[PDB]
Write a protein that binds this DNA or RNA. Structure first.
Ligand SMILES: Nc1nc2c(ncn2[C@@H]2O[C@H](COP(=O)(O)OP(=O)(O)OP(=O)(O)O)[C@@H](O)[C@H]2O)c(=O)[nH]1
Ligand SMILES: [Mg+2]
Ligand SMILES: [Mg+2]
Ligand SMILES: [Zn+2]
Lengths: 121, 148, 48, 240, 50, 49, 65, 13, 35, 134, 181
RNA sequence: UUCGGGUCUUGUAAUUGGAAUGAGUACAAUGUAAAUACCUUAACGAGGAACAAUUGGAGGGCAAGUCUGGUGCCAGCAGCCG
């Protein structure tokens, strides 16, 4: 019913933020809604993470539309302060995108979170 | 319009990079008969041959042949109906089984073919990326399977 | 295969004499088979 | 490549309702049912014919799996002019608009979608195309829109769901004609990532046989997609 | 040296007598590792001619 | 031997492109059409008998 | 700098001594000579250098210890 | 083709 | 394409391309020399 | 029955029967009596020493003909004369009359090849890696 | 005399080395993982064959059998620790599903390439043999070194390496000295 | 098998850069009964990186060359030799 949906629980939020930090270290993370949008256009997004506390929430509501058209999983986390910190940057992040790579060192970890997000949707 | 079937994307030249454990095996009618003659259990015999779980499969054509064989081969029919053996439907008029198996491996490069028929084995050998299982000696033998 | 690489050395073909330069390229066997074959084609058709 | 003011030669494809634009590069093209505008930002080709200005749209094989089917050389397509088509998985007008172009004014497309956000764009696009009936409903429960759909010539399924075989079976038993066409786009990862694509493609073909659907041809969609295939079958309700 | 190999080839073609190798000036080596390597290489090359 | 097998493998990747279509990341940039052309009368689908 | 640590110390009055394993951290240095180790061990244990004996030192692969 | 044929002559023979 | 570069025919645009003209001139001369 | 005893106490008869019958195989008979090397090419050895008598093909016209590569050899163990093959006509220069040759298994009827001459490999001589000592 | 020291062969030649499918599989493997020869592939296949034969024998035994429990648990724990077997697949049935690529992905060469310290598997091999890589505090110069789950996040450039914070190698300082001169 | 067919960044016998490292040499220490070596490590030590991997196998091509036969120009054998 609320615009930011589905919102991950506390346990899933930590598991999501774990993968975001690893992808940051391996150069497999795109930070910001603008960069996230380009990944969807190129079809190189493994899934999308959004911040539910964005002010206003509407500036990132184009992303779920692009995802559902492209059949890309997406999920909302409660805090952009926490999302940006785990992204490795010094500022809040409202949206991030895990880039597709079947030759990545964190492939198993990424697919584990992706499977749970599909269950959430 | 002319038709040239595409090469399967599961093939790296002569190597089938799709067939990985657990395996799916298409059983031929005579494979069951030679299996009984050598006292080789189908599920255990395949698990010993490949060191992996094998998912044996019997098509309608093969099941029809086993039934037409008669009372002499009663044992083979009962073994064919073991619940661990799954069944594949056929949508072609003929009950000839050798052509049925050859068409399936042409369509999908994911099956091992288990057969002792001399004619069928040459036909399968020409199709690239198709491992060929058979019972010889005391146990099963597999030819074109690099993972072994 | 008991051959050495020296045994398989390239033998180089000679060219027309300078004094004979005005007469043109010095024909060799591979050249001759082309005009020998071409002539036979004309004579066979011309006979028919 | 195919820049703005370039000139091309438009000739028909082997398939009715489908065209090829020649040049230094070749393009797959369908005639625009709603001329003057693009649905998803594709290039358009204008031809002056006796003089009225007819328009054409470029069909991108990287955006549409059906177009990837045309490029790869499918033998039979039941989507043709003057046919009713049930399109399952119509996220928006990206590929339904091209299917609407092929069937033409005389045919119709029943575009079924579930999610509401893509459904809004599907409804908006359908207003420009009178031959599209947008049905924002779950394809797992065809009973919910039986009033809205009649008997149909072809069923096209792009639902990227693990239980897509059931959905295609349920919709065909109600709405598809005997000897009708079925065209499924299969994505191996969605159904079973644990096994290889070839195992998935074989399994889906077995489920179709179980549902009185006779497969006719199978095609894999490289270089446009990875681990994707299109299976074309015929609905033989009498017997296989 | 060249004249060592020259004698051996003269000997090989006129009837090989008993040939016994004597290595001298081995005190000039400063390392034991290099001394052993020289002896091994020297011995095995001698083993081709004899 | 390592260098020899590296050159053998990269050579085989080139030849694989001449045996079948291979996915190479998809679309990059604006879509510019089929560069080698479209053949109207040729089908590559595997047909069930 | 060079660090010296002693571990597994056994007081052995049967032989009138203390026995132990010696770890030497010597970053950016080839190794530490037995003489200088004896001097430092004599310093830390408050014994004459003649009463200290060190042996069996193996540098770790990669160096530095 | 000419090079090919000369090799078919070998496998035939 | 810029408006001035656009031409009614496909060929007239191809003449405009300077790189194409240079290649055709070079390739044409070589064939005539061989001929 | 199958013509053999089957009783639980007939092990002696089964054993004694097998020992008597095992002598029927020629392989068993040759193996036990040590006569398996009578049919050997060299009477039990892998190589044979020989003396080069004369070169049968040295006067043939066509180069590298099968006859040109033949040599007559006298085996030193028993003195019987045989024919051996040399790898090529070039290797024929290293072979000369009255030289010791080592033969190994290989114009039908010629069934040996020369592998060493004067204690040196012919292939080593052919590759110019050794000199034949005289 | 002194007691014998044990030794064993770590590989075995395959049944039919000349099958075309086998040669193509070996080509793809050696190319994708940067292997030197077929003997490395044979070594890994030998280990995997031993493991899967052990799992087969244990699966033949009755569930709750003491030997089955003990040895199957040991094997599963080892495979999970080395990273080949996932934490969610702790059963002998998934032990029978393992493949050579699962073991090849755990080699230090592959890990060094994947973590981004090298631009290819061959650059990774060169970096490892040239003493540039450390697992924790230890320089490892063995490409076939098998990385554990805990060891994965500790792969780095060694303190002594010019890429790890030390002074430049001979080439760099030779060039700098000549440029200064 | 002829009929031909399929497909697209491929080829170069082209130029060019400065980074890495140990075989080896070697202060030294370590090691050892004393040594040698290994493991450490100053200083040296790579572009034909001549700091010069091997061992078997398959198949060509060439001359004002040589030998043999024969329904002309071919065929066979062969070719370190013109
Ligand atoms: N250091 C060292 N000097 C040696 C050795 N053998 C010979 N010498 C020296 O080398 C010099 C030559 O020794 P000679 O005995 O005369 O050798 P040579 O072969 O007779 O020399 P020529 O007759 O002049 O051709 C002498 O000063 C020897 O002391 C050796 O093993 N070590
Ligand atoms: Mg030797
Ligand atoms: Mg160092
Ligand atoms: Zn059938």
């Amino acid at each position: 019913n609320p615009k930011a949906f589905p919102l991950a629980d506390a346990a899933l939020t930590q598991q999501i933020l774990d993968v975001v930090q690893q992808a940051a270290n391996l150069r497999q993370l795109k930070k910001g809604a603008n960069e996230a949008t380009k990944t969807l256009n190129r079809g190189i997004s493994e899934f999308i993470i959004m911040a539910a506390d964005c002010e206003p929430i509407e500036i990132l509501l184009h992303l779920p539309l692009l995802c559902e058209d492209k059949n890309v999983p997406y999920v909302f986390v409660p805090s952009r302060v926490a999302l940006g910190r785990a992204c490795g940057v010094s500022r809040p992040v409202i949206a991030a995108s895990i880039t597709t790579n079947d030759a990545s060192a964190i492939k198993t970890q990424i697919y584990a979170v992706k499977d749970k997000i599909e269950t959430l949707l | 319009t002319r038709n040239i079937p595409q090469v399967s994307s599961a093939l790296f030249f002569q190597y089938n990079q799709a067939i990985k454990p657990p395996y799916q095996v298409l059983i031929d009618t005579n494979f069951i008969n030679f299996s009984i003659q050598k006292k080789v259990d189908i599920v255990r015999g395949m698990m010993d041959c490949l060191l992996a779980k094998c998912n044996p499969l019997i098509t309608d054509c093969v099941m029809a042949e086993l039934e037409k064989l008669g009372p002499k081969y009663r044992i083979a029919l009962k073994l064919a109906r073991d619940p661990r053996i799954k069944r594949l439907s056929c949508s072609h008029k003929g009950t000839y089984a050798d052509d049925c198996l050859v068409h399936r491996v042409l369509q999908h490069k994911c099956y091992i073919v288990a057969t002792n028929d001399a004619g069928l084995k040459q036909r399968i050998r020409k199709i690239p990326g198709i491992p060929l299982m058979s019972v010889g000696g005391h146990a099963y033998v597999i030819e074109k399977l690099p993972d072994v | 295969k008991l051959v050495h690489d020296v045994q398989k050395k390239q033998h180089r073909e000679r060219s027309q004499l300078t004094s004979r330069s005005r007469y043109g390229f010095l024909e060799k066997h591979k050249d001759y088979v082309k005009r020998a074959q071409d002539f036979h084609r004309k004579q066979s058709t011309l006979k028919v | 490549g195919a820049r703005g003011g370039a000139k091309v030669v438009i000739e028909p494809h082997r398939h009715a309702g489908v065209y090829i634009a020649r040049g230094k590069e070749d393009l797959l093209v369908t005639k625009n049912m709603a001329p003057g505008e693009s649905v998803y930002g594709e290039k358009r080709i204008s031809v002056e014919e006796p003089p009225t200005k007819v328009e054409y749209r470029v069909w991108n094989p990287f955006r549409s799996k059906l177009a990837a089917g045309i490029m790869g050389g499918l033998d039979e397509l039941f989507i043709a002019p003057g046919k009713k088509v049930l399109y399952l998985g119509a996220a928006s007008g990206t590929s339904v608009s091209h299917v609407s172009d092929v069937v033409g004014p005389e045919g119709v497309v029943y575009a079924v979608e579930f999610s509401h956000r893509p459904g809004r764009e599907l409804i908006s696009m359908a207003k420009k195309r009178p031959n599209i009936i947008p049905i924002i409903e779950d394809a797992r429960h065809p009973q919910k829109y039986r009033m809205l759909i009649g008997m149909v010539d072809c069923v096209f399924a792009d639902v990227a769901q693990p239980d897509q075989a059931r959905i295609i079976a349920l919709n065909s038993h109600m709405f598809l004609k005997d000897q009708g066409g079925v065209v499924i786009s299969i994505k191996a990862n969605c159904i079973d990532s644990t096994v290889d694509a070839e195992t998935v493609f074989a399994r889906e073909v077995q489920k179709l046989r179980e549902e009185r659907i006779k497969p006719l041809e199978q095609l894999t969609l490289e270089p446009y997609e990875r681990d994707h295939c299109i299976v074309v079958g015929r609905y033989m309700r009498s017997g296989l | 040296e060249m004249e060592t190999m020259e004698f051996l080839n003269i000997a090989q073609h006129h009837g090989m007598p008993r040939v016994l190798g004597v290595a001298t000036h081995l005190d000039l080596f400063k390392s034991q590792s290099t001394l052993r390597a020289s002896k091994k290489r020297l011995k095995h090359r001698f083993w081709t001619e004899v | 031997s390592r260098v020899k097998k590296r050159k053998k493998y990269q050579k085989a990747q080139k030849k694989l492109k001449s045996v079948r279509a291979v996915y190479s990341g998809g679309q990059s940039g604006v879509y510019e059409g089929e560069k080698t052309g479209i053949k109207k009368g040729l089908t590559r689908s595997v047909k069930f008998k | 700098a060079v660090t010296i640590r002693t571990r597994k110390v056994i007081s052995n009055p049967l032989l009138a001594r203390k026995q132990f394993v010696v770890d030497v951290l010597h970053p950016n240095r080839a190794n530490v000579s037995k003489d200088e180790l004896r001097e430092k061990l004599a310093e830390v244990y408050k014994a004459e250098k003649d009463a200290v004996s060190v042996f069996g030192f193996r540098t770790q692969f990669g160096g530095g210890k | 083709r000419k090079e090919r044929l000369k090799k078919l002559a070998k496998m035939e023979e | 394409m810029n408006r001035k570069e656009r031409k009614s025919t496909i060929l007239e645009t191809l003449m405009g391309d300077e790189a194409s003209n240079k290649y055709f001139k070079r390739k044409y001369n070589e064939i005539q020399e061989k001929s | 029955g199958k013509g053999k005893p089957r009783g639980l106490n007939s092990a002696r008869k089964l054993r004694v029967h097998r020992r008597n019958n095992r002598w029927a195989e020629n392989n068993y008979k040759k193996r036990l009596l040590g006569t398996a090397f009578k049919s050997s090419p060299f009477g039990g050895s892998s190589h044979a020493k020989g003396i080069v008598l004369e070169k049968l093909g040295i006067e043939s016209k066509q180069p590298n003909s099968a006859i040109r590569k033949c040599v007559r050899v006298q085996l030193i163990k028993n003195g019987k004369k045989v024919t051996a093959f040399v790898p090529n006509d070039g290797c024929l220069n290293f072979v000369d009359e009255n030289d010791e040759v080592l033969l190994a298994g290989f114009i039908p009827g010629v069934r040996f090849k020369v592998v060493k001459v004067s204690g040196v490999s012919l292939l080593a001589l052919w590759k110019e890696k050794k000199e034949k000592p005289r | 005399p002194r007691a014998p020291r044990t030794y064993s062969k770590t590989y075995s030649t395959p049944k039919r080395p000349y099958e075309s499918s086998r040669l193509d599989a070996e080509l793809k493997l050696a190319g994708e993982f940067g292997l030197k020869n077929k003997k490395e592939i044979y070594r890994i296949s030998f280990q995997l064959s031993k493991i899967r034969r052990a799992a087969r024998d244990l699966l033949t035994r009755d569930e709750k059998d003491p030997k089955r429990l003990f040895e199957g648990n040991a094997l599963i724990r080892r495979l999970v620790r080395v990273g080949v077997l996932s934490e969610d697949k702790k059963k002998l049935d998934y032990v029978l599903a393992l493949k050579v690529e699962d073991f090849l992905e755990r080699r230090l060469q592959t890990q060094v390439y994947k973590l981004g310290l090298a631009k290819s598997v061959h650059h990774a091999r060169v970096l490892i043999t040239q003493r540039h890589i450390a697992v924790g505090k230890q320089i490892v110069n063995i490409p076939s070194f098998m990385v554990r789950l805990d060891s994965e996040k500790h792969i780095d450039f060694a303190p002594t390496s010019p890429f790890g914070g030390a002074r430049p190698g001979r080439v760099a300082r030779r060039n700098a000295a000549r440029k200064a001169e």
